[PDB]
Every structure is written in structure tokens, then in C-alpha cells.
Design a protein around this nucleic acid. Structure first.
Ligand SMILES: [Mg+2]
Ligand SMILES: [Zn+2]
Lengths: 163, 198, 52, 190
RNA sequence: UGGCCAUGGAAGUCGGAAUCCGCUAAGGAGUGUGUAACAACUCACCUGCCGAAUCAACUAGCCCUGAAAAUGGAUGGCGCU
């Protein structure tokens, strides 16, 4: 692939977002698109098939091109999975009131989220990851009748099962 | 602020002195944030990395506190840019790990030269740009099918020679970084005994 | 077209300046006041506009 | 208010011989003599130590505008000792875009001719200050060296040929041309 | 953490409700340079060097800018520091 076109071991993975809705122009026309045997119609169809139902919201799509097809993998972001676990549906068509209902209270899913964390954030045991994930969100941030300021600091559970 | 932070810093240094009795005095020199994060991810479980400052002269108080004599060796040696590595397992294995924890760390203009610098026969990977910056120093660079090719291995920077600005910029364009060591260890404290890092 | 360190050395004398809002005087880049009596040491200063 | 005393000492090295006739100091040594008349400055200049090891400057009952002069007398004494021992060498490079600026000294370094600045036909003659020697150095393309003892005379002679090569009625942010001072050091380092 | 409305673009960046943890020595969901988006340059805190008075905001005196007219022009004049 330097001289004109020689695919030897093309497995190029780049960072890409906005793959839930097909949009108007889909941000695929520039140089990443036509270079690498990636068409626009089949690529938009496979991107829609990966951004199909559950969930229809804007996520992160990392793409693998095996010279004919694009495999899109969604890395688990904490705010994206909290907004996906938010009550569906709200895309358009009686939108605008607005996105921030927040009646989930993150009961028994953050355990599996901490299990699927990809060893980032330079962490100790899960007592720090709890305080990270309790303040990273911005919708309801805690239980319905609580405040996320001085309650997340005292957690006496979930120290062993999270790794 | 400025009182509770100092009290928490004192509690942290007395907790690390009560936890790990063995400490390594290493260099906290030119380094990046992602590089320090890689150093912490390397020494995640066993070692603890800490910054030294002017309130590190509380080892006199640690010696006054009726527990451990012969702590006066570590008191004058807080000079330069100081990092503390608190650990418990071994001395020479963690010293070899800190030696093998070297960073590429693309060079700067003005630093000293630890070794001699050679340029292998490898193209720049670019088009037919200007060759004046490479030919002003005395490097045999030709244009053979676009890419600028070096036709002779020329020793540019010797031992103890100052690094020029133009040669530093052409080394940063050729992406060769020999001017890095990472962290420099000075004193090894081993449970009261002070050894030579050889 | 020009050597870059000598270009920066020319920038240090020709462009790295502070300009008053009242009397438009060319001042050193570390300035917080103005020299001139005619503006009354106005201290309304701006950086000199860099060339595009 | 009036501050009762502001004193400052200057420890001279053994290669320097200084003396004073009232407020008129004279500094001689290796490279020559330099005199400075600190009349109308209105301070006290004592000279103490065996073989006059230090020059002490006093200001008695002076407010802020005359307390600001003790350190400038000390700085002129440091610059004069530096000019006597080590000298002053100002390096200044000819920065040009297209037209190469032709610089030539005439007698020794006294008269300097500047040609081909912005393609102009008018030659620029500059007389240097008495005691400043101009030269075109080696191992460098277009660069002038001003050597001397008095920092006042050397830097004024540099400012004359820096202000002679100015660009008129143009954008000087684009036309970066002229002979500009790049380095300020001594003749010998020691 | 391409966090979040903004799709016409905010991975600090035209803007606004938001606005904390981790490494911790340390980066505010950010002061600018600047972008169809980026990238990159670059500010809280501390260490290596000099080792004792310093910083910030108001406020009152005298002086200065603000403050430009026509015959030559007036603290009364000379002048006065
Ligand atoms: Mg014009
Ligand atoms: Zn002004």
C-alpha cells in the first residue's frame, strides 16, 4: 500500500464515532473512505446494521477492514452505556423534553461494567473505580432520593466480585 | 488548602515510611505524562512512586521519634530532581527493571551526549523536498526516486559533544532518539545500609 | 526563503512588541504601562498583530 | 521618606587598578584605561582595603529617586571592570530576504559602508565611536563583530548601524531586513 | 471523556445548563495561539540554583494625560524650584 496499491496485511483500526444514525452526509466522504477498499453504500449499510436496535444512540465504532467487509466493534464507554440503559425510545418526533429523565439508579449493571473495563484509568482495587463511575455520569448521578457528593465515599460492598 | 494538604502529605509520607522500609532515590528528570503513567502501570502493585520536595526533611523528625537511628545519611542527599520508589521485594531486580524501563523520549537541543550517534542507510519516507538542511552538515544525501536517501554512515555526534540545533531538528525529522536514559538512580537505602548503585 | 533562527531574531526586534491603545507606541513585550507622557501611562496595551 | 543610608560594595579583582579624584573614577588594567565622571550624581565614593580591594558607594538621606542610583553606579562599575578585563564583543548578523547586504570597513573599523540594502543605490556610511573596532568575522557568512572597552560606545555603535538599516514606508513585519544584534559577550572568557 | 445540548462543527476550544473522582506531585470537563474537525505550541502545584521582607485591591494629597482659536499676552510685571 505505499507504492500505488498493495494490500499485504491491512488490518487498520482507527477511532470513529457517530455510527448510530446514518445522518445526512455520514462523515465518510473524505480520504479515509475511498482509500482502503471501503465503499460508501455498503459501508453505511453495515454501519447501520451495527448501529441497529438496542441501541439507536450515538456510540463509538472501531472498524476492522479485511479487504472486503468492515467489522464495527463498540468499546464500552460508561456514559454511553448509562445513556443506553436510559429508558427507550427517545430519538426525535416528540423529543426536546429533553434527554435527562434519569430513573435508573444503576443497580446491578456497574459490576459487569467494571468487569468489562479494559484495564484503563491506572486503577487500584474497585473502591476507586466506584468513586470514578459515580461522578463520571451527569444525568441523575445517584439514587432518586440521594446526592452524589458525600454518599459514594462510604461503600461497604463489591470489593471482591468486581475483579 | 495549604494546611490540610500539608497534613495529608505528612500522613502519606509517614504511612509510606511505616509501610515500605526500602526506598530508591531516582531521577525525576525530563519525562511526559503518558510516560509517567506507563512507569506507574509498570510499578503498579509492588512499588510506590513519589515526588521529593523541601518537606522531605522530616526524616530528622523520623529519627527524633525514638525509633530508628542512622537516618542522617539521607538528609544531605536530597539534591536535584528527586523521586522516591518505595518497595519491599528486592533491590537488584527492581534496579534492573528501572534500567530496562527506558523511554525513547525524542531529543532536545542542548543536552549532553551519553554515547556516539550514527545514522543508518534509511530513506526519510517523504517526497522530493529540500536537501539543504541535510547537506549543510556534511551528510551524503541523494534523491533516488523521490525519497531522500543517505548513502554513507556518518558519525555525527560524538561522546561529550554539544548537540546543535540543526542536527537536532534533522534527528527529530529522521525520528531517531538516542538522547534518553529515563531515570537516574543515585542512592540505594536498604534497611539502614547504604549501597553503591553499580 | 530565510533561516528560521535569524527570522526569529528579526521577530524579536520587529514583531514581539506591545502597542498602547492611546498613543500607539511600540513597547517592549514585558510591559504593563506605557512610557509616553502624552498618553498619561494609559496601561491599555495589546500585543502587536502577527503577520499571517 | 528619606532613607538614612543606602550602601553597596564592589569587590574588585587583583587584575584591576581603580582610583578616584572625588567623584571622577578611573579604571586601568590589561586592555587600557576607562574614566567616568560621576559628578552631578551626588553620592559618596569610598575606596577601602589594602591595595584598594573594594569600592563602596553611599547615599545618605535620599528618597526613592536617588536610592535608585546606587545600583546603577555599581552596574557601571561592573561594566567598566568587565570592559577593562574581558572587553566587550557584540556580534550582529545581517538578516536579508533576497538582496545580500554588503558590509565593508574602511580605515580599520571606523567607517563602515553598507550596500545593497533592499536593492537601494544609496550607500550607508557610519562612523563608529572612538574606541570601537569593527570587523567581519570568519566561519560565518554575513556577520559583524564590534570590539571595545566601553559598553556605552560599543552598544551605541551597534545601535547606529542597526538603525541605519531600517525599512521605510513598508510592512516591517514582512520585510525582515537589516543588521541585528544577536550576541553580547566578551573578547576573552577567562 | 469524541462526557453533555449543539449535526453545521466542540476529543478544553462559535456558546449555554453542567461542573467530580483516578495517577495523585499534577492539569480547572480549562486562560490563549486556532480549527469543515484535528493534531501541535502553551498557564494552578513543586523541586535544582539567590536567601528576607513581599504581594493584591481600594482610598486620599501634589503633579501629568484628558485640555483645541483665531493681533503678541499676562500669578499685575520681572521672575521664582
Ligand atoms: Mg504600503
Ligand atoms: Zn501609551
Amino acid at each position: 500500500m505505499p507504492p500505488k496499491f498493495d494490500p499485504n496485511e491491512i488490518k487498520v483500526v482507527y477511532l470513529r464515532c457517530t455510527g448510530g444514525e446514518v445522518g445526512a452526509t455520514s462523515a465518510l466522504a473524505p480520504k479515509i473512505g475511498p482509500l482502503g477498499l471501503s465503499p460508501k453504500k455498503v459501508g453505511d449499510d453495515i454501519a447501520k446494521a451495527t448501529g441497529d436496535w438496542k441501541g439507536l444512540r450515538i456510540t463509538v465504532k472501531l472498524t476492522i477492514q479485511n479487504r472486503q467487509a468492515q467489522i464495527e466493534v463498540v468499546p464500552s464507554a460508561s456514559a454511553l452505556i448509562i445513556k443506553a440503559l436510559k429508558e427507550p425510545p427517545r430519538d426525535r418526533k416528540k423529543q426536546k423534553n429533553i434527554k435527562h429523565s434519569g430513573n435508573i439508579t444503576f443497580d446491578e449493571i456497574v459490576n459487569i461494567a467494571r468487569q468489562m473495563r479494559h484495564r484503563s484509568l491506572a486503577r487500584e482495587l474497585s473502591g476507586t473505580i466506584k468513586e470514578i463511575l459515580g461522578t463520571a455520569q451527569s444525568v441523575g448521578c445517584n439514587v432518586d432520593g440521594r446526592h452524589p457528593h458525600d454518599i459514594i465515599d462510604d461503600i461497604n460492598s463489591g470489593a471482591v466480585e468486581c475483579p | 488548602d495549604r494546611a490540610t494538604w500539608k497534613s495529608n502529605y505528612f500522613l502519606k509520607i509517614i504511612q509510606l515510611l511505616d509501610d515500605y522500609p526500602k526506598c530508591f532515590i531516582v531521577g525525576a528528570d525530563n519525562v511526559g505524562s503518558k510516560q509517567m503513567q506507563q512507569i506507574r502501570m509498570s510499578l503498579r502493585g509492588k512499588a510506590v512512586v513519589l515526588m521529593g520536595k523541601n518537606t522531605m526533611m522530616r526524616k530528622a523528625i523520623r529519627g527524633h521519634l525514638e525509633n530508628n537511628p542512622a537516618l542522617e545519611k539521607l538528609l544531605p542527599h536530597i539534591r536535584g530532581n528527586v523521586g522516591f520508589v518505595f518497595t519491599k521485594e528486592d533491590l537488584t531486580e527492581i534496579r534492573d527493571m528501572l534500567l530496562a524501563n527506558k523511554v525513547p523520549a525524542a531529543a532536545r537541543a542542548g543536552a549532553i551526549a551519553p554515547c556516539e550517534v550514527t545514522v543508518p542507510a534509511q530513506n526519510t519516507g517523504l517526497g522530493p523536498e529540500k536537501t539543504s538542511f541535510f547537506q549543510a552538515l556534511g551528510i551524503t544525501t541523494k534523491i533516488s526516486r523521490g525519497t531522500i536517501e543517505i548513502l554513507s554512515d556518518v558519525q555525527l555526534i560524538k561522546t561529550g559533544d554539544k548537540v546543535g540545533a540543526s542536527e537536532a531538528t534533522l534527528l527529530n525529522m529522521l525520528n531517531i532518539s538516542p538522547f534518553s536514559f529515563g531515570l537516574i538512580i543515585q542512592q540505594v537505602f536498604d534497611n539502614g545500609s547504604i549501597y553503591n548503585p553499580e | 526563503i530565510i533561516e528560521p533562527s535569524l527570522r526569529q531574531l528579526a521577530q524579536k526586534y520587529n514583531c514581539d512588541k506591545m502597542i498602547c491603545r492611546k498613543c500607539y507606541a511600540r513597547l517592549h513585550p514585558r510591559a504593563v504601562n506605557c512610557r509616553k507622557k502624552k498618553c498619561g501611562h494609559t496601561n491599555n496595551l495589546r500585543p502587536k498583530k502577527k503577520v499571517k | 521618606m528619606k532613607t538614612i543610608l543606602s550602601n553597596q560594595t564592589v569587590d574588585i579583582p587583583e587584575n584591576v587598578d581603580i582610583s578616584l579624584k572625588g567623584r571622577t573614577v578611573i579604571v586601568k588594567g590589561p586592555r587600557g584605561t576607562l574614566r567616568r565622571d560621576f559628578n552631578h550624581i551626588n553620592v559618596e565614593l569610598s575606596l577601602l582595603g589594602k591595595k584598594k580591594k573594594r569600592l563602596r558607594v553611599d547615599k545618605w538621606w535620599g528618597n526613592r529617586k536617588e536610592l535608585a542610583t546606587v545600583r546603577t553606579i555599581c552596574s557601571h562599575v561592573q561594566n567598566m571592570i568587565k570592559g577593562v578585563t574581558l572587553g566587550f564583543r557584540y556580534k550582529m548578523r545581517s538578516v536579508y530576504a533576497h538582496f545580500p547586504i554588503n558590509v565593508v570597513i574602511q580605515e580599520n573599523g571606523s567607517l563602515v559602508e553598507i550596500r545593497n540594502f533592499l536593492g537601494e543605490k544609496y550607500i550607508r556610511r557610519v562612523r563608529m565611536r572612538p574606541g570601537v573596532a569593527c570587523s567581519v568575522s570568519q566561519a560565518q557568512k554575513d556577520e559583524l563583530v564590534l570590539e571595545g572597552n566601553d559598553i556605552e560606545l560599543v552598544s551605541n555603535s551597534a545601535a547606529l548601524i542597526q538603525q541605519a538599516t531600517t525599512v521605510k514606508n513598508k510592512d516591517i513585519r514582512k520585510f525582515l531586513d537589516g543588521i541585528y544584534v544577536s550576541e553580547k559577550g566578551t573578547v576573552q572568557q577567562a
